[PDB]
Curated annotation (Swiss-Prot), chain A:
Cysteines joined through disulfide linkages: 9-36, 11-53
Residues of the full protein shown: 22 to 92 of 98
Residues with Citrulline modification: 5
Protein name (Swiss-Prot/TrEMBL): CXCL10(1-73)
């Protein structure tokens, strides 16, 4: 049985690389919980099974949320 | 390489009602594509992990997205 506090976390590292909105299949936002002490953001790209953990702290990411949510 | 996939929007119905960010377990934003002409937002609620589609066009959801974007930065 895993330590419950972080059982759910799925990101181990982050990418500060600009994500091209037109390259996103979808964006997942996972608010912190009693199973993962931090907010995790995962972008699923359209090409070659790529996915990536994004910096929820960053603002460029916040502009991504707005874009992805509007178009 | 692309996998076989759904070629239509995935939401049966979409909710216009306000949502308390606290009750959200997860949120996924799916941008419009040639498979579904509009953005879809699938919420996974903490209760029974019920999957509920949110209407990104509704004021309530636009508000939820804003509360989320804020309560996401120190």
């Amino acid at each position: 049985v895993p330590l419950s506090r972080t059982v759910r976390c799925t990101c181990i590292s982050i990418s500060n690389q600009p994500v091209n909105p037109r390259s996103l299949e979808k964006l997942e936002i996972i608010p912190a919980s009693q199973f993962c002490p931090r907010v995790e953001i995962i972008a699923t790209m359209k090409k070659k099974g790529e996915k990536r953990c994004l910096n929820p702290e960053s603002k460029a990411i916040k502009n991504l949320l707005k874009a992805v949510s509007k178009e």
